[PDB]
Amino acid sequence: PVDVSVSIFINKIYGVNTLEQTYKVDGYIVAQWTGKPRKTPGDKPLIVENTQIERWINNGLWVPALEFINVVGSPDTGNKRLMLFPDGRVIYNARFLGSFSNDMDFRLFPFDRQQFVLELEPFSYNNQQLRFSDIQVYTENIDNEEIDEWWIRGKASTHISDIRYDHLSSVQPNQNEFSRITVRIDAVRNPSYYLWSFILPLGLIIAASWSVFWLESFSERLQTSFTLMLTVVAYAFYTSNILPRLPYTTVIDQMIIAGYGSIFAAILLIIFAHHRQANGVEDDLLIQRCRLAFPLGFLAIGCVLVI
Template sequence: MKTPRDIVFFIGNVLLLFPLMCFGRYAHETSPLEISVSFHLNKIYDINSMNETYLIDGYLVLLWEDPDNPFPDTDSAEVTYENSEFPDNYPIPTFEFINVLGKREILNKQLKFFRGGKVMYNERFHAKFTADMDFHLYPVDRQVFNLQIEAFSKDIEQLVFTSAELTPEKLDATYLKEWTIMGTRDTISKITYEHFNGISGTPKVFSRCTFEIITERKFNYYFWQVLLPIFLIIIASWLVFWVNDFSNQLNISFTLMLTVVAFNFFTSTLLPRLPYNTFIEIIIISGYTSIFLTAGAIIFNNAVVLKKSKKMSLRLIRIFRWLFPLLYTVFLAILISVLFLED
């Protein structure tokens, strides 16, 4: 039979522990799960500028603390489950790739429980991703290929990414024959979704982790195969000022115009339809303009000036011989300064 002293002692313990249990439980339930993310890039390849897509093969590792993890009764410091051995009753934090196209293919997955409460999820995956690409400077452009991971269905009050790491520091560029890797960047940000307003009355904020691979397009191919021929065609269009026969002058100008049109068809197959002109398209348009003005100058000289004075006609032709190259050189200098030096 319990004495009054025992009853008083029991009630005192209950009064002392009850607030601690309540507030401790509340803090545990309201503090978000903190996850560190690391991404090891095996390769990035099959970059398609037309579709603005690329393929990524890599390893994703998530690490978090869970004091209640089901660590088995064993002397080992860690326990590993792989693929089909995955425990069905343990909830892995939900996440998604924001900029993935279709469904990612998980080649292998691993779950590790560490004595002391740490849990690590590791998977090797393969998927197609997309990113907004800026082609203003094409084909001397830089592009940022990224991979965005975000918590799914859990806002920052429930789950946050605390750190991000992209490895290796020096990426393998053998799969990027058209690109040079300039560097990498990893960031953690908060993304607000307004469409939750109608449900909860307030927008939801989610944690997002972004890994970026900064690349620069290799220019050599486009210089030798596209830009140099266009410049040579433009220079050739000025040679009509050294041709005396008017019909030959017109034939040369219109033939060169059709050649530039062919180059325009070629470059249009390399890029998506854009609301702006790229650097290479501006060069092609300048080729149209130069050849058109050259033909116009020849027609004006033969139809107007030559009828008035042959001497004046010859003098005008001599002016055109240096005026057209000078104006085009000034145009290129202004174009390069606007597009590249201010970038």
């Protein structure tokens, strides 16, 4: 089994899609393995550029075809080169630009924390023909930087494992385990834009929804509740183009639900305090004292939403 020594240089991370859970990684990759000695012009190494590599593969040079597992679409390679040494070791350098994917959990959406993963694997050689001896990742350009609204925290984590495929078992009996290199990069979301853009106006709308009971006329109370309903609908659209259709509920979706519930409970209590009459002569003040109750109750609901 040939011992390949991979080394990855993450040049930049960008294009982080939350609706699609993809991200674009641009970088270089250097593989290195020892073969048999050869005769090079002079005694220096020999550099072979892009379209001259297959002229060497045709004459019997063994270059493995590494691939990225978690990629979305075939990656965009740029330049590539071989470096052949008279000592015998071959070095394959190549520039990649790929669109990768990972499982993201958005249950704390503005105050989020995910990781960007790169999974590299030989396409056709098992660990009985090719194994990765080590892996070195050089995130110098993204070490502690604010790429988008994403804080990259610390040094990347590397791992080498063996993955078994139940397909190819009829092709290679018991020699169907492949080496795999995994690179993980932790990232923390910067929640500031969602604070001054989504949390503050929705909180003020819920406060102004509590502030309906300080009116008098039944008609103004209902029309006020309906204008506030229209504002909540506008903010319900405006939060839909930042986050996918998740089965659970985030903070902002819970605030939209809280605004809807505030308006509906205010309408219900207003209609009830208008209809709770003897015949038509009664006026209610035992139930219009929720100027302090509804802030207390909905503060308790927000607190139990925090826990």
